[PDB]
Amino acid sequence: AQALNTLVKQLSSNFGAISSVLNDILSRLDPPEAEVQIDRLITGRLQS
Amino acid sequence: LYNSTFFSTFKCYATKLNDLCFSNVYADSFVVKGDDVRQIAPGQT
């Protein structure tokens, strides 16, 4: 359970990005600026 | 109203008519300087 709880909670982590929710970096920023933001949240959640 | 070039800025803080969905949206109206147009933005302390 503790391994799951760590795995669940790190979805909330910003990983140095603007948001930790994709529907606010996409629906507010421009699609050139949305790319680098959605780039890092993939890499940050991958190494979780 | 966004379909106009009589205005100058349209700076919202496209995707910025996709984010316009919230509670009671205001229309705070005021006369600024051209040096104060730059300081109508979140922050600008």
Strands (E), chain A: none
Q: Which residues contact B21 (CB under 8 A, 6 or more apart)?
A: none
B19:A30 CB<8 A: no
Breaks (C-N over 2.5 A) in chain A follow: none
- Angle (CA) A34-A35-A38 rounded to 5° is 80
Instruction: Report the distance separating Cα A16 and Cα B32, nearest Å.
Output: 35
Cβ distance A29 to B15 less than 8 Å, yes or no, reads yes
Question: What b-and-e string marks burial along B14-44, b requiring 16 or more CB atoms within 10 Å of the CB?
Answer: eeeeeeeeeeeeeeeeeeeeeeeeeeeeeee
Residue A27 DSSP SS3: coil
In Å, how far are A7, A44, B13, B45 from B36, measured between CA atoms?
Answer: 47, 39, 17, 12
Q: What is the DSSP string of B1-44?
A: --S-SSSS------TTTTS--SS----------HHHHTT-SS--
Report yes or no: B38 and B11 within 8 Å, Cβ to Cβ.
no
Per CB-CB distance under 8 Å, the chain B contacts of A30 are 14-15
Asked if residue A17 lies in contact with residue A40, where contact means CB atoms within 8 angstroms, the answer is: yes
Structure tokens at A32: 């050139």
